[PDB]
Every structure is written in C-alpha cells, then in structure tokens.
Ligand binder design. Structure first.
Ligand SMILES: [Mg+2]
Ligand SMILES: [Mg+2]
Ligand SMILES: [Mg+2]
Ligand SMILES: [Mg+2]
Ligand SMILES: [Mg+2]
Ligand SMILES: [Mg+2]
Ligand SMILES: [Mg+2]
Ligand SMILES: [Mg+2]
Ligand SMILES: [Mg+2]
Ligand SMILES: [Mg+2]
Ligand SMILES: [Mg+2]
Lengths: 172, 159, 58, 185, 51, 222
RNA sequence: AAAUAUGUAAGAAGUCCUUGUUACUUAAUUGAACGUGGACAUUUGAAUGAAGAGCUUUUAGUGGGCCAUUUUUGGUAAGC
RNA sequence: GGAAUACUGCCAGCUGGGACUGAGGACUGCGACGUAAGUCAAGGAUGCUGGCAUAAUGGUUAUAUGCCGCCCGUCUUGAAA
RNA sequence: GAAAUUGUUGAAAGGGAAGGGCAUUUGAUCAGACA
C-alpha cells in the first residue's frame, strides 16, 4: 500500500488478579508506518486467540532492518489470498536484496496478475533460499546461470525538446 | 380492519418465565412502600386486576399514593413535543423497589464518613468520581515469558 | 385518485425545534387523587400545628 | 459553512426605549440612564427598565396598597416608589404620614396623602433626595387581575372564562356544560 | 488594531515570555545530551532477529 | 497636576515584579520538560539492558480537527461535534483523554482527524492562533495582562502557564481549555497527501486516529 | 439469546441527631404525613458544552410531495 | 571493535528572491536596546526621485475577442418543454 | 404632440437567429483639479 518497512510487534493480554503476567505473543508485520503495523497485529491475533484491542495491549514495537541490505538473495514467499470466488494458497519466488524490497514486488505481482488488493492477501512466511538447486521456479533459475550475460537492444532516448533535426538511432 | 385493543401486541410481554408459573412468592406482599419511593413497573400475567398498560412496561416512576392493595405511580410520558404527567393505580404484584437509586444511598453515606474522617487530617477529600483514566507506565519482565512468534495459518476445508 | 396514507417522516425534526421539554418540578405537588381519608386527617394536623407554632410566639 | 447552534441576528426581546413620544417621559429616561450608568446601584437599573413598560404592564397602585406596605416591620419610614399612576381608595379610613414618589397622582390620591400630612413628589425630585435609592420601597400593581387575563388559556377542564358577549340563561350553559346534556366540559 | 505573530516579529516575542532572551543566549535549542554506554540484553537482540 | 510620576513609577515597578515572576516560572518549566523527556528515554534503555520491555504510559491529551463540511450529517454525530466546539471545517480543540471522552471520539470518527500533540505544536498554535473567550468575545492573546485578568484565580499568569496546563493536564485543564476560543486553521500548505480524504488513515485516507502523525498535519494547517 | 435503540438516578426541594400536631393508624407515643430547633458549603457529589434561562398573548402560510443509502410488504418485474 | 550516513523529530539558528495589502490619524499601552539623556522593526507607511498636467489615467457608448448564458408569467413532486 | 410603426441622412456590425454577464483592445464622445 506504500513503501514497506518490517515491524516487530509484541503484544499481551491485560493482566488480571487470577493470572498475572500473561504470555507474550510476537509476529512480524509489513506495514507502511507504525500506525498500520499495530492495527494489523490485532487483525491477525483476533484470528488465533480470544483477545482484541480492548482487552489487550501492545508491549513493544520495533523496526527490523536487514542485516545485509546489499547482497542479492533468493526469497520464497507463501501467501493466502482471496479471489472473486474462494480462497487459494500460492507459493512464489522473488529475487531481490531485502525482505522489504521483495514484499513490495509480491504485492505488485499479485495485483497485476490476480487482481488481488492489499486487504485480501495474507503473508504466511517469507524465507531466504540458501542453497542453489532448491529454486523450483524457472523464471528465477535463468538468472542463476554461470557468467550471466545479455544485451539491451533497441535503446530509446528521452527528448527534452519537441523537435529533433536528425533521424534518431536505437543503437546501444 | 385494524385492531388496537387494550392488550394488543402483548403475546410475549405478559407471558410467565420458563418453569416460573403458578402462585406468587410471599415476599411480594410483605414489602412496604411509602410516598416518594422510586419503583419500576413489570406486569404480572397471573393477576389481571390492577395490571398496567403495555406502554408502562419497564418504566420507572415515583410513588405518590398508598392504598389498601395498590399504590399510585407518577410517570412522565412524551406526547408530541413535550412530556405529560401520568398517574397509575397498580397493585403491588406489578412493581418492585428499583435499585437505580439504592446504590446512590451508599455513596452519600460513604461521602459523609470520608469527609468526617479527613476533616481533622487534610483538606480536599476528593468526594467526586472519576472516569477510567489512561494506564500508567509499567515494565514487563520476560523472565520465563519469552515471546512466542505467531504466523497466519493457511487455508483448509476440513468439511 | 389514490394518495398517501400515513408517514412519520419529518415529524421528529419538527418536535426537536422547540419541543422535548422536561416538565417543571414544583415543591409541594398537588394532592389530587390521594386517599380521601388521609387528606381529611392531614388537614387537621396542619391546623393543629399552626396553633402550636402561634402559641409559642404569642 | 458554519453549523449554528442557535438562531442568528436574533433581537434581545426587551424594550430599550419607551414606545411613547412624551417629551417629559423621555427626559426622565435620559436622567435615569445617566444614573444607571455612573452609580452602579440596583435601584437605578430597576427604575430605568420600569420606565419602558406599557400601560397594561403598569397597573395602578392604590393608597390602600401603600398603607399595607408601610405596616411591614421596620418599613414605616421609607419612601414608597411607584413607577406609574397612584389611585385613591375610599375603603381605607386611616393613612400614615409617608413620602410617595410616582409619575402621576390622581386628584383624589394626592388630596388624601397631603391631608394625612405626607407629600407627593415626582421621580426627578427623588433622584435629588435619593441618588442611590436609599430607604426606598418599590410597589407594583396586580397584572393578573386584568379582564383579558381570565380568558387566556381557554380549553377543556381549564376553568377559564369564555369569550362571550351576552351572559344569561341561554348562553353557553347547554350540552358540554352539564351531565344532563351530553357531558360536562 | 493589528495582531502580530511571534516567531516572525522578535519584539513581540520579547513582550510575552521574557525567558526567550535567556533561551537564545544559552543556545538551549541545540543542547547536547550526556553520553551513555548501556547495551541491550542477549534476550532482546535474539528476539529482534528471530524469524 | 499631581499623580503624574508617583503612580507611573509605582505601576512600572509592579510591572517589573510581574516580569520577574514570569521569567522565573518559565525557567522552571523548561527544566521539568527536559528532565521528564530524558527520564523516559533513559528508562527505555535500562529496560532493554535488563532483558525487559518498557511500556510507556498511554497519552492523556489529544487534538481533534474537523475535516468535513456541515452538510449531510446524522444527528448523533452532529450533536457530539457541537459539544466539542467543532462547527466549521478545519477547527481544532484539545480534548482530555478519559473513558467518557473516548466514546465521543468513536461516534465522530469519520468526520475528524485526531492524534497526540507535542510541545512544539502546542506552542506554535497558541502563539500564532491563540484567541481567548472573554465576556463572550474573541480577544487575541497579545499580552499577559488578559491572561492574568481571566485566569489569575487558577494560578495562571502568563501565556506559558496556559501552555503548561495544556501539555501537562493539570487540575485546571477544563477552565484553561474552555478559555481558549476554538482554533481556526486553514488548509494544509502541502496538501493532505492522499487522493481521497474521507477514508480511514489506516486504509489510506484522512480521518481516524493517526497518533503522533497529527503534528505534521497541524503544522501544515497552521 | 445479541448489536442498535429505550426508562430512572448521579444531592441544599440533600443527609444526620432531637422532639411538636392529628378526628388517620397502631395491643401500645406504634406508625404515617406535615413541622420547630441543631450540625455539614459550592472537588456541593461523574464527563463535555451552553449567542443565558423560564414564561405568556396573538397570527400568517401549509395540510397533493418526492429522491438516495439501509430495514422491509405485495408483485415475474417495473422510472410499480 | 570504532566511526560515518540514511530515515524521523526539535531549534525562543542565520540568510536570499517573488507576490498581494497601507486600514487608523495629537498624546496615553506592553516592551526592547542604553549608566544616563534618549533611541527603536514596540497599540496599522513612511522617505527620496522622475515624467505628464491632458483625453494621458478614468467614465459612458458602439464594436471585436476568450469563457459562460435555453422564454418569461403560472399550476405542479418535477417546465426551456 | 409621447410610444408602437415608417421615410431620408450619418456611423457601425453581419458564414443556418438576435439579445445578455465578467474582463480588456480599438473608434467616437465627456466630467473633475491645475493652487
Ligand atoms: Mg373484572
Ligand atoms: Mg395527504
Ligand atoms: Mg457519504
Ligand atoms: Mg502549491
Ligand atoms: Mg483528492
Ligand atoms: Mg483606458
Ligand atoms: Mg460577446
Ligand atoms: Mg454554453
Ligand atoms: Mg402533472
Ligand atoms: Mg415552469
Ligand atoms: Mg419613434
């Protein structure tokens, strides 16, 4: 829905006299800012435990930064999304340098190919593929070839003026 | 044509509770009412005499008259754009002592005690109620309570 | 030439322009409809206490 | 776009100046406007506001009403102030020696007050004697004794008088008044 | 007759709040904070990087 | 003519004493503002170093801005807006957070944008758009005399004392807050940042509870 | 057995101590209602707001409606 | 193990360019800078300079150009019909 | 000796209507102060 950041949200139920110091629950949330991340925390917690915002509290929220933002990685993502009729599971693989920059690619692909909005997509798990040959999508394996090499034919150059005085060329 | 009798649309209003039919318990006739008491109206289906109209069901009034087996109740009824004063003659089976103001009698009694106790000690007794104030700061210890990571579950049928 | 029969539309808006007035409460409310036997003896009680108060400040 | 909580450009609803064109009355208004502004005495503000009233809002105050007010405990030596006309009453046979200030005195009321040993003064003389209204007493006549009042609020079971021209046996005593003829009110 | 906004007119800013003179003189808007060397516990960082 | 220098000297001397009191009070408020914020920051560091989590106290003050016109409003939300003195679009008013006031905010949720103001936002609002209600009149806050004349009995004698009672909810918050005329803001200079305002801030609109993000919005409108 | 709507209460016309009247009532100075005198001021009894509150007289026009979201009846449906 | 920077926030930090406005008409108030006398951007614009003194500005009127503009009165839920 | 209506002279505009509102160009015409 915007540029994505990864937030760690830790919540808890309100302590009572019968059971003081209740259990702590944590989950990673991808959100535009801090306000959305806390709201998404209660959305997922209400699907797992008998608790809501009124009877619970947020213990701590922290932003997660990539350990190695400048290393190319292969990411496998599991998603649960709702189509116009029914719910479907899906596994896709995205090659990028960070989790935040790979989730945004996933949301663009889901909207472009399946017409799925943000409100109807659940991110089950995002994991990094560590070993080659564990990639099972051919559109990613083709970039893992030894000594990758490809040209860029038919270059188009932007023009700042309305008129040009020579026929352009598309060489590169 | 249309029917607008005295007891119309009272099929379920005047029914007795489940497994609560028969005679009336004796404590109803032993309670005493005075002028100025605040009571609420709830009609009893077993007694067809002195039974209030369906409008006054679940309404609270003030006693203004006492009789042999009945009392007078004053209720303000909204008619049009103003309120009118209504006087009802209802038997004691159809009313009970409302507890809306009964709780208020404890706080005024407690306010007098608290004011007297703090009169010889400190000013500003704080004799006013306050709403639920926002929670203060706290520290949550993780000793034996390490957070557990949760993830959304996939889709399944189980039908 | 049939027409409309009944509606409550716009009725509550007219009532809230100047209406919805809580009735005035007066000290010493009217004693209409109270027990006649109680009222008879209450009149003599008020008459008696008037004489007693006057006798103290004669 | 303003969500008004009340009516806009609403007038106060009280008289600010007299409706009459009497030059002498407007002189009294000018005199007491100055007093009500530079004396901060509640008496002056009351008198200034009372000068704007209409005829029905200024009922006559009889001499008997004045005498009864003088029988109050400790009010025997006060100046009675009546913003209006003072009339004479023949029902009373004794009158004190007080001082009364009023707009108008009838030919009979003035004679009775003077004969008793008192004096009749105008409102402008009172400001000289009592700039702040010291030792004063304001009396007002009855408003609900007016003939038009008894017909106000006419309705069933109200006990009000009806607007009728001729009163008699055959005038509004039939059906609707007695049980023998249909019903009673 | 004419309202003048403080923070755009310095003289009005000195009319009200006379402490503004002291605040600017001591450069209290750029006060340096005391350095601390506390380190988070191993529990906090492990939970932070936990999958 | 007498009383030409005697009373002037006495009056100027009285003014100097009042200036000294305001100077000393503003110094004290500055110290407690700095001390309080550093303690909160230090507490968070200490909790992390001890393997715990520091849960900061819930906010007690909110600033509510009406973002919709006066047409097509259901009655119950309309009445609540009047009780919060929000009669024209882009008006603001500080609200103390209690259990009773939270239910009011939920009813008028689609029509207002509110959050948690900071000290900087509060100071700029009062200095630039601070007007007082004196004898049912809107009087600009251009001098400390009017504050003293209308809030002296509550211990407030300066514009910074008025700000102090707002940022820190004191015993006289109700009288101080009701003294201020409702703020009249303009449209944001940079825009609202969204194509459609009338959606919740979570879904990508304007209204709702945007917490500390309100400070960026208010400054644009102020 | 909900949600939404709905009645009442949140003090001075209040609370407490003592004792005066009556043809009502009680086995009974028992009780009921109404009172004299004494004690507790506006953190005086939750929140917010209040271009102030309350009251009266008189009279015009109107008494063919319609549309949208939601609930909903008849009809296959309708710009019914 | 020691720094840098990005992001967010604060400054009663400094400073350049452009546009609109000049209401009020003796003094009075709150302040600032000064040992003082005084001064000041402090309860609303002044200083300096040029051309012209007339159809030049401006008014009225006809026309042209850009955009907009359906025929009034009436009955009606609804009229340019 | 008014208007509807009409003749002559003079000025102007006109590609399936004319008339109107805001602003300005052009032509014709006109008041005000020269202190
Ligand atoms: Mg029978
Ligand atoms: Mg009809
Ligand atoms: Mg809408
Ligand atoms: Mg722009
Ligand atoms: Mg938009
Ligand atoms: Mg020109
Ligand atoms: Mg044109
Ligand atoms: Mg057009
Ligand atoms: Mg028709
Ligand atoms: Mg028409
Ligand atoms: Mg002609």
């Amino acid at each position: 829905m915007a540029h994505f950041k990864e937030y760690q949200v830790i919540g808890r139920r309100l302590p009572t006299e019968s059971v003081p110091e209740p259990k702590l629950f944590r989950m990673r949330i991808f959100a535009s800012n801090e306000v959305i991340a806390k709201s998404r925390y209660w959305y997922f917690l209400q699907k797992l435990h008998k608790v809501k915002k009124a009877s619970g509290e947020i213990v701590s929220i922290n932003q997660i930064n990539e350990a190695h933002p400048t290393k190319v990685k292969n990411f496998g993502v599991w998603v649960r999304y709702d189509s116009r009729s029914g719910t479907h599971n899906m596994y896709k693989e995205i090659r990028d340098v960070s989790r935040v920059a790979a989730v945004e690619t996933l949301y663009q692909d889901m909207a472009a190919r399946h017409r799925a909005r943000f409100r109807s997509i659940h991110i089950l798990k995002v994991a990094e593929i560590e070993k080659t040959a564990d990639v099972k999508r051919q559109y990613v394996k083709q970039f893992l070839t030894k000594d990758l090499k490809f040209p860029l034919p038919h270059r188009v150059q932007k023009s700042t003026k309305t008129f040009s005085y020579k026929r352009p060329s598309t060489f590169y | 044509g249309k029917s607008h009798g005295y007891r119309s649309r009272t099929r379920y209003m005047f029914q007795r509770d489940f497994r609560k039919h028969g005679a009336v318990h004796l404590s109803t006739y032993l309670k005493v009412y005075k002028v100025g008491d605040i009571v609420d109206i709830k009609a009893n289906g077993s007694i067809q005499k002195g039974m209030p109209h369906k409008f006054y069901q679940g309404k609270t009034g003030v006693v203004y008259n006492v009789t042999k087996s009945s009392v007078g109740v004053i209720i303000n009824k909204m008619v049009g754009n103003r309120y009118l004063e209504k006087r009802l003659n209802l038997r004691v089976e159809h009313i009970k002592h409302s507890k809306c103001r009964q709780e208020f009698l404890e706080r005024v009694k407690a306010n007098a005690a608290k004011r007297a106790e703090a009169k010889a000690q400190g000013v500003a007794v704080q004799l006013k109620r306050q709403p639920a104030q926002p929670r203060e700061s706290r520290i949550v210890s993780t000793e034996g309570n390490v957070p557990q990571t949760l993830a959304p579950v996939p889709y399944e049928t189980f039908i | 030439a049939k027409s409309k029969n009944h509606t409550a539309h716009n009725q509550t808006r007219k009532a809230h322009r100047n209406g919805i007035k809580k009735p005035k409460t007066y000290k010493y409310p009217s004693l209409k409809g109270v027990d006649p036997k109680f009222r008879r003896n209450h009149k003599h009680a008020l008459h008696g206490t008037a004489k007693a108060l006057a006798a103290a400040k004669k | 776009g303003i969500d008004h909580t009340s009516k806009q450009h609403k007038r106060s609803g009280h008289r600010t100046a007299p409706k009459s064109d009497n030059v002498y009355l407007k002189l009294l208004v000018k005199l007491y406007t100055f007093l009500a502004r530079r004396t901060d005495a509640p008496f002056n503000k009351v008198v200034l506001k009372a000068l704007f009233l209409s005829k029905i809002n200024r009922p006559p105050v009889s001499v008997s009403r004045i005498a009864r007010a003088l029988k109050q405990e400790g009010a025997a030596n006060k100046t009675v102030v009546v913003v209006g006309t003072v009339t004479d009453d023949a029902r009373i046979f004794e009158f004190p020696k007080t001082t009364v200030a009023a707009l108008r005195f009838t030919a009979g009321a003035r004679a009775k007050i003077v004969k008793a040993g008192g004096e009749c003064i105008t409102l402008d003389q009172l400001a000289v004697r009592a700039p702040k209204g010291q030792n004063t007493l304001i009396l007002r006549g009855p408003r609900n004794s007016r003939e038009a009042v008894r017909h106000f609020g006419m309705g069933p079971h109200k006990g009000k008088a009806p607007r009728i021209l001729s009163t008699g046996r055959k005038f509004e005593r039939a059906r609707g008044r007695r049980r023998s003829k249909g019903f009673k009110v | 007759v004419l309202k003048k906004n403080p923070l755009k007119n310095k003289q009005v800013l000195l009319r009200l709040n006379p402490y503004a003179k002291v605040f600017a003189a001591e450069k209290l808007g750029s006060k340096k904070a005391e350095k601390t060397g506390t380190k988070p516990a191993a529990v906090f960082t492990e939970t932070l990087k936990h999958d | 003519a007498e009383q030409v220098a005697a009373e002037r000297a006495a009056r100027k001397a009285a003014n100097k004493e009042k200036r000294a009191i305001i100077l000393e009070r503003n110094a004290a408020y500055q110290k407690e503002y700095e001390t309080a914020e550093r303690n909160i920051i230090q507490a968070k560091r200490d909790a992390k170093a001890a393997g715990s989590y520091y849960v900061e106290a819930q906010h007690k003050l909110v600033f509510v801005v009406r973002i919709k016109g006066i047409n097509k409003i259901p009655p119950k939300p309309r009445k609540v807006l009047q009780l919060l003195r929000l009669t024209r679009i882009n008006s603001g008013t500080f609200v103390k957070v209690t259990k009773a006031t939270l239910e009011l905010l939920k009813l008028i949720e689609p029509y207002v944008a509110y959050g948690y103001p900071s000290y900087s936002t509060i100071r700029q609002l009062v200095y630039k758009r601070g007007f007082g209600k004196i004898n049912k009149q809107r009087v600009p806050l251009s001098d400390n005399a009017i504050i003293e004349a209308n809030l002296g009995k509550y211990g407030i004698l300066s514009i910074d004392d008025l700000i102090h009672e707002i940022i820190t909810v004191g015993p006289h918050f109700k009288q101080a807050n009701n003294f201020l005329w409702p703020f009249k803001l303009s449209n944001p200079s940079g825009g609202w940042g969204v194509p459609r305002k009338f959606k919740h801030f979570i879904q990508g609109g304007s209204f709702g509870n945007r917490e500390e993000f309100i400070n960026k919005l208010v400054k644009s409108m102020n």
